[PDB]
Amino acid sequence: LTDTDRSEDFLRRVRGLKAARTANGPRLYQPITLLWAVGRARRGEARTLAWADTDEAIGALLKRHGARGERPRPDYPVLALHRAGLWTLEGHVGEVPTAHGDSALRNWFAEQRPVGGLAEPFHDLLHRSGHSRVSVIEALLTTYFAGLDPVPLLEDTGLYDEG
DNA sequence: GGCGGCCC
DNA sequence: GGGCCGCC
């Protein structure tokens, strides 16, 4: 195996992601979100986290490392990663919205304030398997950071040695 | 038209 | 709250 079974399923969901495009490349919301979660999985940090702390932590990485003009709005990639089955959200009424729109996304997180994080099987996988971490880091760097310097982001996520 | 997103 | 773009 389930490590090999889960790793292949994990990497398949990551490769199926469809990020929004700028003129010169895909926007960095989803890879920055994922690498934040990968670092947390590696160090065994709390998988399930309150939205206020998740929003602030991802937002700070968006501000510092948003090399294609990203806004500090983690609501976009979190919703997209949830739809892909990579992210869990708990404590909300009704259905989770898609990452389409703007104000409705912010208002939904402000009202529902869901608790969540990377899905439990993938968090556990990346905590246990250094090979799975290296695999997804390389794949995300290949897809999203062509012509960009990922080193400051890797050190801010605690993944410099593995990336 | 849907979904990931920016601009008002 | 809205319209709209890129890509599917």
Residue numbers in the entry: 3 to 165
The study reports:
The sulfur atom of phosphorothioated DNA (PT-DNA) is coordinated by a surface cavity in the conserved sulfur-binding domain (SBD) of type IV restriction enzymes. The sulfur modification-dependent REases SprMcrA and ScoMcrA use an SBD to recognize the DNA backbone phosphorothioate link of the RP stereoisomer, which is adopted by the naturally occurring PT modifications in five DNA core sequence contexts in prokaryotes. By contrast, the SBD of the PT-dependent restriction endonuclease (REase) SprMcrA from Streptomyces pristinaespiralis has a relatively relaxed sequence specificity, targeting GPSGCC, GPSAAC and GPSATC, but not GPSTTC or CPSCA.
Crystals for SBDSpr in complex with the RP form of the 8-bp hemi-PT DNA oligonucleotide 5′-GGCGPSGCCC-3′ were grown at 14°C using the sitting-drop vapor-diffusion method in 48-well plates. The crystal belonged to space group P6122, and contained three molecules of SBDSpr in complex with three molecules of PT-DNA in each asymmetric unit. The three SBD molecules and their respective DNA molecules in a crystallographic unit were well aligned with each other (the value of root mean square error is less than 0.140 Å over 165 Cα atoms). SBDSpr clearly did not make any contact with the DNA strand without the PT linkage. In addition to interactions with the sulfur atom and phosphate backbone, the H102–G103–D104 motif of loop A5 inserted into the PT-DNA major groove to form five hydrogen bonds (H-bond) with bases of GPSGCC core sequence. The carbonyl O atom of G103 formed an additional H-bond with N4 atom of base C6 in SBDSpr-GPSGCC complex. Compared with SBDSco, SBDSpr possesses a longer loop 34, containing the three positively charged residues R69, R73, and R75, which constitute a local positive interface with DNA wherein R73 bonds to the phosphate group of C6.
